[PDB]
């Protein structure tokens, strides 16, 4: 179950999709965010990452449970000028740049992360029929 | 002319952003609890420190984002948080609630100054 949720919050129809990976054979991790036309990702580095776990509580040694935290609880502002997203569930504050990914990498991404959502909602509602 | 501005961005105002004065603090406000950074001069060097180059002014940055209509928020629970998506990178800060009786003078205050603010402003684009 990797994280996500969708904005704006609540009735309205879902205008954004916020993700993340992977932590977990590891992947380095990163957040998501995509309109399902165009992506933006923190594209972290090694060391943007830890610069960024400097700023705020955490060691380097995982960001997906604050992140799961937020989803959950509906938590998660984000901003675009030609992006940057807020994780407010937890104690403090956590701010993100996101930039662009290129289409060449985003739209295998985009496709990927369609069929992934339909084979999960398939899959959560036969064990919902628990 | 202290920086300031209002969400959500032409439907009714619900927030205000503001802040002084260089000690430094961001507010927000529904005009009727009041939420705000509360530093102290080592608690803002420090966050000077975990970002923000030198710890030798935010209001520039601050001014930028408010012109430039970028400023996220979230509210809850005597708890807030506000957001600068400015410049090098995003900033974040948290904001907690102010009690009524230290809110109240600030409040008063922070209205009767917009007030004065809006009669000598137009009095000065009278000019053109």
Same mark, same amino acid.
């Not at 965010?33 to 972290?44: K, N, P």
């Not at 999960?120 to 029929?129: G, H, I, K, N, P």
């Given at each position: =179950?990797?994280?996500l949720?969708?904005? %704006? %919050?609540? !009735?309205?129809? !879902?205008?954004?999709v &916020?993700? &993340?990976? *992977?932590?977990?054979? $590891?992947? @380095?991790?990163?957040?998501?965010?995509?309109?399902?036309?165009?992506?933006? =990702?923190? &594209?972290?580095?090694?060391?943007?990452?830890?610069? #960024?776990?400097?700023?705020? *509580?955490?060691? /380097?040694?995982?960001?997906? !449970?604050?992140?799961?935290?937020? &989803?959950?609880?509906? /938590?998660?502002?984000?901003?675009?000028?030609?992006? =940057? +997203?807020? +994780?407010? *569930? @937890?104690?403090?504050? #956590?701010?993100?740049?996101? =930039?662009?990914? %290129? @289409?060449?990498? /985003?739209? !295998?991404?985009?496709?990927?992360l369609t069929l992934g959502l339909a084979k999960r909602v398939?899959? #959560?509602? $036969?064990? +919902? /029929?628990?």
């Amino acid at each position: =179950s990797p994280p996500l949720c969708t904005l %704006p %919050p609540g !009735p309205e129809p !879902p205008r954004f999709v &916020c993700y &993340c990976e *992977g932590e977990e054979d $590891r992947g @380095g991790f990163n957040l998501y965010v995509t309109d399902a036309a165009e992506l933006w =990702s923190t &594209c972290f580095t090694p060391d943007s990452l830890a610069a #960024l776990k400097a700023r705020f *509580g955490l060691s /380097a040694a995982d960001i997906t !449970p604050r992140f799961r935290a937020a &989803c959950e609880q509906q /938590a998660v502002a984000l901003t675009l000028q030609e992006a =940057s +997203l807020t +994780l407010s *569930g @937890g104690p403090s504050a #956590l701010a993100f740049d996101l =930039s662009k990914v %290129p @289409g060449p990498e /985003a739209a !295998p991404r985009l496709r990927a992360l369609t069929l992934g959502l339909a084979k999960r909602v398939w899959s #959560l509602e $036969r064990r +919902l /029929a628990a």
